[PDB]
Structures are given as C-alpha cells and as structure tokens.
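User: I'm putting together a teaching handout on how multi-component assemblies are represented. Below are the sequence lines for each component of a complex, exactly as they appear in our records. Could you produce the 3D structure of the whole assembly as structure tokens, so the students can see both representations side by side? Please keep the chain order the same as the input.
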Amino acid sequence: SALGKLQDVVNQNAQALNTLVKQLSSNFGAISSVLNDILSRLDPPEAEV
Amino acid sequence: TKCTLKSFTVEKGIYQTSNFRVQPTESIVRFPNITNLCPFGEVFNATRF
Amino acid sequence: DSFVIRGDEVRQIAPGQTGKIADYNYKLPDDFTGCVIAWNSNNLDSKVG
Amino acid sequence: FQPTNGVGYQPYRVVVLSFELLHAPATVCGPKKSTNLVKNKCVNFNFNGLTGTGVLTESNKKFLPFQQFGRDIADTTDAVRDPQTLEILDITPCSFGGVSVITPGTNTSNQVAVLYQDVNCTEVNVFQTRAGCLIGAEHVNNSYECDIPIGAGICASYQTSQSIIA
Amino acid sequence: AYTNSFTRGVYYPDKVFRSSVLHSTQDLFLPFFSNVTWFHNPVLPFNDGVYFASTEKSNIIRGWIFGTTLDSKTQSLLIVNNATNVVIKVCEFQFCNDPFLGVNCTFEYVSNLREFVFKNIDGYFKIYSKHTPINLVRDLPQGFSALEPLVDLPIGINITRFQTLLAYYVGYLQPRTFLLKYNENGTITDAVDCALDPLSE
Ligand SMILES: *[C@@H]1O[C@H](CO)[C@@H](O)[C@H](O)[C@H]1NC(C)=O
Ligand SMILES: *[C@@H]1O[C@H](CO)[C@@H](O)[C@H](O)[C@H]1NC(C)=O
Ligand SMILES: *[C@@H]1O[C@H](CO)[C@@H](O)[C@H](O)[C@H]1NC(C)=O
Ligand SMILES: *[C@@H]1O[C@H](CO)[C@@H](O)[C@H](O)[C@H]1NC(C)=O
Ligand SMILES: *[C@@H]1O[C@H](CO)[C@@H](O)[C@H](O)[C@H]1NC(C)=O
Ligand SMILES: *[C@@H]1O[C@H](CO)[C@@H](O)[C@H](O)[C@H]1NC(C)=O
Ligand SMILES: *[C@@H]1O[C@H](CO)[C@@H](O)[C@H](O)[C@H]1NC(C)=O
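Assistant: Of course. Below is the structure of the complete assembly, with chains in the same order as your input.
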C-alpha cells in the first residue's frame, strides 16, 4: 500500500472507462439498449426517435 | 488532414484524421437444428375427409 | 400528384407508412414536406355495374 | 358423388388454414434456416438471439452444457455457443484504429507518412512499431532528437535527397 | 412447522457465462435466513414463484400440480415421474379430492436431496433444479449451492395455486437484489443478499 497514490490514479481511470462502457447498457428511455434491435424491430419513423 | 483541420495549410506535427476499420466480407446466420415439423401430413393426406 | 384510392387506404398516403399502396403504388419520403388532401368521390367514380 | 359427374358435381377436398394470434406466447413459427460459418474473418453474425460484428475464433473456455452467450467483466458479449455444432466461439471485434498523418509543415514540403495505430502491417518501406504500422517512413538506425513524436520511443522527422525517417 | 433457509435459493438468473466476476442482479430470490414451511398433500399459494426441496430415501414424492382451480374448469400443469418416465401435461384434468398414487391439451412432453425453483414470468414457466447427496433427516443442510435451469415451458398458463404429489420444504420468492460470485469456471460459488444486513449492504 506504500505506493497507494500511483495505484489509486490507475484505479480511478479504470473505473471511469468501465462506467463509460456500462453506459452502453442503459436504455436512456428507449425500448432497448441495443441499437441493432431497435433498427431491426421498429419502423424508421419511431426508430429515429 | 487538410480538411479535418479546416485549412489549406498544415503545420508540422502528427494529427488524427479518421479511423481504419475492416469491413465484414459477408454475413452468417446460425440457428438450431430444424425439428418438430407441424403435422400437416395428418391433415392434407388424410384417408377419409 | 393526383390519383384515386379506397378510403381504408387513405391512411397509407403519409410519410413512414406501409401497406399495399405505400409499398407498391406510391411511397412518400420519411422527411416529406408538403400537404396531402383527400376527399370522397363516390358520386363520380362509382358505377352501378 | 358418381365418377361420371361433371366437374361441378365432382367432389373436391377443402382445407382451410386459420392463423390465430392471441396475447399468449407464440408456438408456431416457420423454418428460419441457417448457413455455414467462417472463422478468422470479420463477419456480421446473428446467433440465437444476439447480433453483432466481429471475428469468430476457436475458444479455450469450458462452457457449461446450458450456457449459450459469454460475457466479459464490462457487460460485453465475449463468447457464444454455436447452435448446431457444440463448439464455443470467441468473438474478437474486428481490427480498427486511428489513422494518424505524420507531416512536416506544408510550407516546407508535401510528403507525408501514415501511421495506422495498433494494427499489424499485414491487414492494411514499411515499419512495424509498438505504436502500429508506419508507411512512408524510412527506418534508420542513427538516433536523433525527437521532432514529431510517434510513440514507444519512436519519433519521425523530415531529414536528408530528403525524406521522412523514423 | 418452520425452518431456516440459511443461504439456499440461489439460481442462475440466465444462460450467460461470467468468469471471476461479482455481478449485481435484481430478481425473485429466497431471502437469506428466512422462514420456509416444513411438511411431513396440502394446496399452497404460488404468489411469485416457489422454491421446493425434498429429502428422499424411498422416492415418496412423485410430482406436482399447478393451476388456478384444478377442478377441470381451466388448464392446469401436471408433472409426474412414474418411476422411469417424466411426463408433463397441461390438459384440463379433473382431479380427485386427494390425488394420491398407489404406495383440452395444449402441450404434452415425455422423457438424497433435490431442490427445484418454479416460477412464471411473461407466460414462461421456468423450472430450475439441482440434486445432491445428503446425510441428514431433521432439517435442511447448511451450505451454498446453485440451481441450474432444466425446463422453460412456453405454456402461457397463469398459475395461482399448486400442490404436491407423494418431508419437504416450501419457500416463496421476493424481489431482492443479490451479488453473485462467478469463479473461473462460470459457476456461482457464493452470493450476498444486498438487503440482509448492513455488512451485506
Ligand atoms: C444437426 O444436424 C446436423 C446435420 O444436419 C448434424 O450433423 C448435427 O449433429 C445435428 N446437431 C444436433 C445437436 O443434433
Ligand atoms: C402427402 O404425401 C405426399 C407423398 O405422396 C407428399 O409429397 C406430401 O408432402 C404429403 N403432404 C403433406 C402435407 O406433407
Ligand atoms: C515558410 O518558409 C519560408 C522559407 O522558404 C519562410 O520564409 C517562412 O517564414 C515560412 N512560413 C511559415 C509560416 O513557417
Ligand atoms: C500481429 O502479428 C503478431 C505476430 O506476427 C501476432 O502475435 C499478433 O496477434 C498479430 N495481431 C493481431 C491483432 O492478431
Ligand atoms: C540497422 O542495424 C541492424 C543491426 O543492428 C541491421 O540489421 C539493419 O539492416 C540496419 N538498418 C539500417 C537502415 O542501417
Ligand atoms: C419466522 O417466524 C417466527 C414466528 O413464526 C418469527 O419470529 C421470525 O421472525 C420469522 N423469521 C423471519 C426471518 O422473519
Ligand atoms: C474448471 O474446469 C477445469 C476443466 O474444465 C478443471 O480442470 C478445473 O479444476 C475446474 N476448476 C475448479 C476450481 O475445479
């Protein structure tokens, strides 16, 4: 743990990236977090929204 | 680089302009083995109607 | 653009619509800009036979 | 029915197929055949319920008899079970990377070099560096002060009849 | 009677592989150290899924009945293991007052401690199971073990009540959040109920 600071820096960055990646799994109000499913399932007028 | 920087002249340096991505050469679709055919034979081929 | 359809198909004359008329007869763009006007013409286009 | 009847009086067998769709789970679907699978090539794939783009490779994992889709730590699909062949395929997303353009100032010259970041030189006077594939740069042994940084200790610059060197 | 459900009732919530990962998922689980009813063929509710467990030395317990009325008025699941053959039917069976065995059909299929999890979500009847040896009579064994999925019936019949066909234990799922530990081999080796205690929180 003596080198904590350095390790800490690394840790923080990783978490950030992880969080960013996890944001791809959120629907943000859409019907599905997967873009391909929305494209293939809905008609263009609503798939656009 | 000229267009990505919006200028007709570029200073010395290294710039990022686009992304190289290999495109998928063809498509593949995989589903389980087709079994359990609906018994349409028992209907269309019945001996008595 | 002038033509004649049946009443049930009037809904199909609109951007982002599907069906017989929309798919195979007259297709508007999804970003269509303009007006659609439809009126019954039973007195004019119908015949006893 | 007598066999000597005219067609209008001869018997015809009729079958009426009705297709009912209720608010209950569907149990009658059509074949939805499949095709062959290819490995070591970038493909757009659609397995049982999932779709994606990537390269399918022979795996090293031991999926359970009931497991279908892998998953990495960051909720990303990692491996799949082929529905027909009982083999587990790793999904490695197809190669990609930035295309950096190393240039001396256009004032001096118009010759340039191209660095494809983090790829082998096979998938594109070629230099394979830890930063990627560099094209148009003459690789020399003599060391000099860094002018245009590339990465991993490699720098490029325009030097003497004159050309770009890394 | 009542018994403690120490750490039992954890089942693979899907068919997704994960290695050396701590995953947080919310679903219907059996709360840790809760009460489970202990019996030595009463009809019980099926609120939101049922965890069922049996200790056997002579194969007394045979099958299950699920439904709403189970009196030939509406379809009802009947699952029976006749001594070599597993049979599942969903006919509108007319049941007896005490349907014991000697000491309109829309689907039909034919094929110590045992744990099963039956639940019904969006018209799908998930049946998870697990078998293990045991040397104990008077109570459930303390320990951890995961239940794999065995059957996913597309039956679509909504269930409210169920009954057994023959000591066993019955517990009722609740909508809790759990943390599951997947080892390198894809199997669940430990779980933490996220609402059990401050330390688990
Ligand atoms: C699926 O069918 C192919 C031939 O069509 C056969 O080689 C393969 O073993 C079958 N798979 C299963 C799981 O039955
Ligand atoms: C009836 O039998 C014939 C063989 O003579 C076959 O070609 C046909 O597919 C059968 N009908 C159906 C509906 O399968
Ligand atoms: C371009 O190069 C010329 C020498 O030919 C020099 O006089 C001029 O200052 C340079 N301009 C810039 C912007 O570097
Ligand atoms: C690039 O080539 C090296 C050896 O030539 C190989 O080990 C490496 O896996 C290749 N890169 C990729 C992305 O496969
Ligand atoms: C650089 O030196 C290596 C040996 O250290 C030699 O193989 C290579 O050909 C040399 N390249 C140039 C451009 O001198
Ligand atoms: C089980 O029931 C007893 C009384 O019947 C009660 O005291 C106890 O709190 C219950 N267990 C739990 C976990 O609530
Ligand atoms: C995981 O499986 C491999 C073989 O599939 C086995 O050698 C290994 O012991 C297993 N891991 C554990 C912890 O048992």
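A couple of points students might notice: Chain A has three helices and no strands. Residues D 62; E 185 surround 2-acetamido-2-deoxy-beta-D-glucopyranose (ligand 7) (CB under 6 Å).
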